[PDB]
Design a protein around this ligand. Structure first.
Ligand SMILES: *[C@@H]1O[C@H](CO)[C@@H](O[C@@H]2O[C@H](CO)[C@@H](O)[C@H](O)[C@H]2NC(C)=O)[C@H](O)[C@H]1NC(C)=O
Ligand SMILES: *[C@@H]1O[C@H](CO)[C@@H](O[C@@H]2O[C@H](CO)[C@@H](O)[C@H](O)[C@H]2NC(C)=O)[C@H](O)[C@H]1NC(C)=O
Ligand SMILES: *[C@@H]1O[C@H](CO)[C@@H](O[C@@H]2O[C@H](CO)[C@@H](O)[C@H](O)[C@H]2NC(C)=O)[C@H](O)[C@H]1NC(C)=O
Ligand SMILES: *[C@@H]1O[C@H](CO)[C@@H](O)[C@H](O)[C@H]1NC(C)=O
Ligand SMILES: *[C@@H]1O[C@H](CO)[C@@H](O)[C@H](O)[C@H]1NC(C)=O
Ligand SMILES: *[C@@H]1O[C@H](CO)[C@@H](O)[C@H](O)[C@H]1NC(C)=O
Ligand SMILES: OC[C@@H](O)[C@@H](O)CO
Ligand SMILES: OC[C@@H](O)[C@@H](O)CO
Ligand SMILES: OC[C@@H](O)[C@@H](O)CO
Ligand SMILES: [Cl-]
Ligand SMILES: [Cl-]
Ligand SMILES: [Cl-]
Lengths: 601, 601, 601
């Protein structure tokens, strides 16, 4: 019997030829795709402009205080203070200040539908000098005639008034937003006129909310710098609006050049555009993002106040070609404007290498074939897509190759399986149908028929290989006997390879000197020597070597991506030093907290 | 000797059988995983609502100015102006304005704990018409009785007063935020009462900061549209609060339906939920994001003011099933509410295809088994995860297959290595232990023993293949001699394949007509013809063909992802036209820059 | 002829040896890279601090109203109201309030360069108690002496004045921002002095905009809590500034400890740093991001007001090592400060496992070898990179292995192709040059020459395999005849494998009992039996089995990533309850809409 039992035994009566099989012919090998095709190009990306129009301006006004004081024993108490900003007449600004840097000590102005007027100190008019405002960090420039408050001189038990008239001139930045038909200052003072209003060009159509005479425009003007007392070298066109409280002056410039609904966001040297099922796809190596567009360009006409765009994109695409392509490529058609999801305007100039110059004609043809645009705040998804495509591309290429390389090999080896099939039809067959079988070749095809199992506790090997029947020669393979069923009548046979029990004992070789062999037998072997038995063996007790070329794949583990913000939207909010809402709220609770708004006395 | 030296020589005395080896049996092939399992479902995603409650309102008030003017030679100067908004009595609004669109030319009100009163022009009471405010772009509607300022008539050297009383009515939008117990206007005016205060329902418990009589509620009210002079068709419940400065009117509505702590963010047709180690995972193809939850639903109870959620999610999930599933699937249980990291509430309806209807019973069971929620600002990580999983999944699948396909092949080919082993035990062996060796088969296993190296500058081939010893036949393989060591005694042998030096010269074939052969010999060959020598050869000088199926892997290069923002947080800030902080800062520096706050006179 | 035509016929006259070929020797197998190398380490990430300095403060002031009323028949009308906040003298706050929680019913102060003064009710001075402000939700604490407005008693036709003097004390939060040289309150009131001004330490150099006597500092002060009337247990250094309108008090603390330009953003247990072409790369498993730095550390010196950084990072890195490494590793050098793109300061402590302790000496050496930093708002790209690298790494590893495993196999199998080549030189050859050819072995190389095509409509098989010429034996392969060209003279031959037409009919086997075979013949077979014809066959009509190990690669589909925001930048804006710009705009339009700013009367 068999020490080792980790195995099975079969009997393989040659197939008649009732069952035949053929080998699958070489399959059609997959073909590498002609390719996903790109278009070299330069690009300039445009985000909706969210910056206000910014420009310096200068105000001139006069703060007028009128106080009344009661005079008594020991003390003086204010009975009332009336403050006010008075706007400066056009002529004064010119003929005084920009003339001689001085101001009247009298304010004459309209207030509440009466022409009021005010004398500093109530003394008669005096031109006073303009001396700078007291020093303040992070302020533009101011100037002021006085810095004291004139109160009525003390006469007992007799109330009276003091007019003081401080002439104030400030330089202030001025901001405004689309559609640029009014602007504001740094004082909080609104001014309800376009910044580009005027007489010159079409400006007159620009918006105004004021009476016609509150605006002047000294064409050809020269500024006298209050501090330096230097006149202006080059003349401006100077705008001057007199609102109920002040006069603001500034230089006029044309609208169209001065503003734009969009901003040049990013400049891309190499911007590769593809078309992915009728949608366009520009991706940058640098910015690592990838945008998606329609196959039609976008009409700048439809863009209100988009002058800069053309001017800006062009200026940069040309600057780029010089630094990097003066030898290198060819401009296929004029620049083209696309609008990627997320509302990012895209200026693209399709290119074409130098060496391969011949194709201008080809693509040029293809390269030839209002409102407010909003831009998302996040470049996230363009990044994702970029990242996903590149990895997708690569992976899908390589594995694709592995597919074919594989197939090429499957078809290759058939040439061996053929010849191998002729050598051991038994084994080759059984490895091909994943079960043990008997087999035979009928010319070009394989006759096969099944193989019968035999209980491993039913197999018996005979001790010698020497043949009493005919001496000199020996059975080349050990002798055995076995039963199919337990109580079944014993059968006689010769051992084969892989526990194949051959019924006929014909496998014979001449007795050679010092013969010593091992044979597959159950879960292990059995050893022989000089044609006589010795012992069995564990498969383990013999040096094992492998035909298997190793490769171990490991999985790429799951990862978890907990959401994480750099700054929480409130953190940002809280960077607001003063909170307007918080203050008005607080301010407007005062009476409710500290006095009585109900009780009539 | 040998022209070509890029090689080595060995001598392979047949192994006795001291060393034996076996072939590694077929390994256990990896098994494809039963799979990661999804659950079809529809979904509606909810971000924390950050919008204030918005609603129209109408104010009615009266600006009262009282000026005093001094009369002198040549001029008039204001000695003081006192402005004020006076709130309108409940009855006036009703019995005048909403009655007949007119207003008294007198204001009677409480101010500073005295019932002051004011006569426009000081002439006695007059009802005056309500004429629209002068035109202003981007304003709601106003109306006003007068538009002039009445100043006291000129009498010389005699001061006096003018009461003017402008009746003003405005429609204004009104905003408020959680917890909705006070609201504000577009005038900046705070009103410290819930918007949902009233007598009806439980509203009375809503917050108030005012005396009880400053509120009225004309149940069943009809608005008379000041401009059109058309009465209101359907009645409202109308709220009217009289703050110290004005009366604001609006229609009352119930709270619960009127507001929600959350907003319906996104509607997802196909939302696939998985469970990944006891955590849930819903991912959308469309939005390309993937969220992570606990395995337990979220109790809407815990959500304060979350009425809409249920109402909204339900409304859409049902609308969806119609457009896309009226034939297609089956609702497993009622909708379920999950809360993904990032605080995104998720309404999910687990589904199940039509064809496979049989499983309701199975999952339904499983589908059965306060506070303020904050939502992050960025959908970044849900996107990342989404992107990572999908690529992970795919890759890990394919390579997984490559692993098995490979293994299947390693086990396959052993069937050839077997039969091949019997044919050239020498070569097969040496390729299996990665070093040259001699070998032999002892039945089912391989007897092996080593092979000895011989200096390439020590090998000598004999010129003829014809045998003086026995003529007619020829050595089938060229004759050689060689020494092991330099000064070692020469040895005689016959050449084999791959520079194998056979000690016995027994390899013999009959001299055939016009014989011509090449033999492996050193870094190249040596050519023969008619059994006599001719010359050697470079391996290179002969047409080479390959058995190698090609595949070339390329690496996917590193990429760098420079951080890039669309808009810098300051860019956003700067989109604030007026900056409150900048202005108050500037405003509150005035005195410090332009006057003196120290010097007592 | 041949029923099946899906095939071709060839004739293969043995090559003379004019054309010979060799097999490509084993190629050099790729070598796995020694590896990308990491450095274990702990980390703490720092975002630019955007929070203002926050600290409690307490103001003390006095609102002074002076009203005049006209007395007439039936009524009283205000002729004017003058309101004002008056600042409290240093002594009062101390010697009254913090002493005895009471206040004078008189205000004495400087206003407009006159020392005005005010008597509550005009009755003489009275100390009055400080009673809390009326209750208001979400306010800090106030207190006030009175809550009524005193108006002049009614005498007919005689105007007069009422001075009322409400003493108010508030606790208010106070905020300020870099460079911390002035701060603000919750009242909107600016205070133009550093919060850290004082006499102690170097503070005196801190900024001031006020006269020197408006500041006091009671070193060693004890607060009396107005409500509880409990004195303060521990003494403060108390700052008190008297601005023109109020006095604000607060405790002084040193600057350096009290503020920091940066904030501890994130704490990373395992932070792996690599160097990628001379740029550093720290990536976290947890936060799933990966940052990029230069190979040089960053000098904290260059960081203005960065005291906390050192203090904070150190404190946490040490806390971490305890929880997780008290046994585990070794601190290679002191902490190191790097600044990753996006301006994220990085505190890193390079570590080294315990078991492998021997390398301190090695890396320690390497670990040894002002301004305002801005931090981007988005952690996007660090995430991308993180995600991309990890997938890149993995993929590039595995496929890399597949490359080698493959190559190892290509070189392996040559050992079979060799022996196989000797068995069927015909077939092996033709599969190696991808076209049918005749072949032969000249020792160690392959003699080859071409094979000739023959029209499939030109091949004829002869019916018996029995040989009239010599009986007993049979042609082992069916007999045929064929022409090369149509009208060409017929040729005689024997069939071979794969439609090989052998010109000589020498393939012969003894007639065996009950012979039955199939032969490859055109697009199918032809069957034989007992050496006589029977019929042909379709390839399809026979059981086919495959030698091909299957593997199917599928592509990972394109995905589209539509841009998607959680909250649109305006949605955020609109979360601003009151909009300052909207209000001032609206407020400053008033006159334009409701009165006349032109018409002089
Ligand atoms: C690109 O062109 C397509 C049609 O040619 C536009 O597609 C529509 O886009 C709007 C958004 O503005 C969607 O709401 C519609 O449902 C889309 N229609 C369809 C059927 O797809 C698209 O507007 C163009 N893209 C841009 C950025 O302008
Ligand atoms: C999901 O359930 C788990 C517990 O079942 C919760 O886990 C905790 O989440 C908080 C954040 O709110 C962490 O600070 C705790 O450390 C977590 N505990 C543990 C041990 O994991 C979690 O709160 C639930 N998720 C949501 C979104 O509610
Ligand atoms: C890292 O060091 C490099 C040089 O060693 C710096 O590179 C420059 O960075 C600035 C941005 O501040 C770029 O505008 C320059 O073009 C860069 N020079 C070059 C040639 O690369 C870099 O500033 C350092 N990084 C940090 C975050 O400080
Ligand atoms: C042209 O290209 C070369 C390339 O090095 C460069 O030196 C030069 O700046 C470029 N000049 C032009 C024409 O812009
Ligand atoms: C039902 O589904 C079909 C599918 O085409 C569609 O035409 C129809 O709108 C759907 N109707 C319902 C019941 O919603
Ligand atoms: C030391 O490490 C062990 C590990 O379990 C832990 O129990 C303990 O908290 C750590 N103690 C120290 C020294 O921090
Ligand atoms: O001093 C604070 C005061 O000006 C505000 O509460 C008015 O609303
Ligand atoms: O004109 C500017 C003036 O109103 C402010 O500076 C007051 O603070
Ligand atoms: O009542 C609104 C009024 O205070 C503002 O329009 C002033 O600008
Ligand atoms: Cl891409
Ligand atoms: Cl996923
Ligand atoms: Cl990484």
């Amino acid at each position: 019997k068999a020490e080792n039992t980790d195995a099975n035994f079969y009997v393989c009566p040659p197939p008649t030829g009732a069952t035949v099989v053929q080998f699958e012919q070489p399959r059609r090998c997959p073909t590498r795709p002609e390719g996903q095709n790109y278009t070299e190009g330069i690009a300039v990306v445009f985000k909706e402009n969210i910056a206000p129009y910014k420009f310096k301006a200068t105000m001139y006004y006069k703060d007028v205080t009128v106080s009344q004081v009661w005079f008594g024993h020991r003390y003086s108490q204010f009975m009332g203070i009336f403050e006010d900003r008075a706007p400066v007449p056009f002529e004064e600004v010119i003929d005084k200040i920009n003339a001689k840097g001085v101001c009247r000590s009298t304010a004459k102005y309209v207030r509440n539908n009466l022409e009021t007027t005010a004398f500093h100190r109530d003394d008669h008019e005096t031109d006073m000098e303009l001396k700078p405002a007291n020093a303040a960090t992070r302020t533009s420039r101011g100037w002021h005639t006085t810095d004291l408050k004139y109160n009525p001189s003390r006469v007992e038990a007799f109330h009276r008034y003091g007019t003081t008239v401080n002439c104030i001139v400030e330089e202030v930045d001025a901001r405004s937003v689309y559609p640029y038909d009014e602007f504001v200052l740094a004082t909080g003072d609104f001014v309800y006129m376009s910044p580009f209003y005027g007489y010159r060009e079409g400006s007159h159509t620009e918006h105004t909310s004021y009476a016609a005479d509150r605006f002047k425009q000294v064409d050809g003007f020269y500024a006298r710098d209050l501090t330096t007392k230097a006149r202006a070298t080059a003349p401006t066109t100077r705008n001057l609006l007199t609102t109920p409280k002040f006069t603001v002056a500034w230089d006029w410039v044309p609208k169209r050049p001065s503003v734009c609904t969009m901003t040049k966001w990013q400049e891309v040297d190499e911007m590769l555009r593809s078309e992915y099922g009728g949608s366009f796809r520009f991706s940058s190596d640098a910015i690592s993002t990838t945008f998606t567009t329609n196959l039609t360009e976008y009409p700048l006409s439809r863009v209100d106040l988009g002058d800069c765009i053309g001017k800006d994109a062009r200026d940069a695409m040309d600057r780029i070609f010089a630094r990097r392509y003066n030898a290198t490529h060819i401009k296929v058609g004029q620049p083209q404007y696309y609008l990627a999801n997320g509302g990012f305007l895209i200026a693209y100039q399709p290119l074409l290498s130098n060496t391969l110059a011949e194709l201008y004609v080809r693509e040029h043809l293809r390269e030839q074939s209002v409102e407010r645009i909003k831009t998302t705040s996040s470049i996230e998804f363009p990044g994702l897509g970029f990242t996903y495509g590149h990895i997708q591309r690569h992976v899908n290429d390589m594995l694709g190759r592995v597919a074919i390389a594989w197939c090429e090999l499957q078809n290759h080896e058939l040439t061996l399986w053929n010849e191998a099939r002729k050598l051991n039809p038994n084994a080759i067959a059984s490895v091909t149908v994943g079960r043990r079988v008997s087999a035979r070749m009928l010319g070009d095809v394989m006759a096969v028929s099944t193989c019968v199992p035999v209980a491993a506790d039913n197999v018996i090997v005979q001790n010698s290989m020497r043949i009493s029947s005919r001496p000199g020669a020996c059975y080349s393979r050990p002798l055995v006997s076995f039963r199919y069923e337990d109580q079944g009548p014993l059968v006689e046979g010769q051992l084969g390879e892989n526990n194949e029990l051959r019924l006929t004992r014909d496998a014979i070789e001449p007795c050679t000197v010092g013969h010593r062999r091992y044979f597959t037998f159950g879960g292990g072997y059995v050893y022989f020597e000089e044609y006589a038995y010795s012992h069995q063996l564990s498969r383990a007790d013999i040096t094992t070597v492998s035909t298997f070329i190793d490769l171990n794949i490991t999985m790429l583990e799951d990862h978890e991506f907990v959401p994480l913000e750099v700054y929480t939207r409130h953190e940002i909010k809280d960077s607001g030093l003063l909170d307007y809402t918080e203050v008005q709220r607080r301010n407007q609770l005062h009476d409710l907290r500290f006095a009585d708004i109900d009780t009539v006395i």
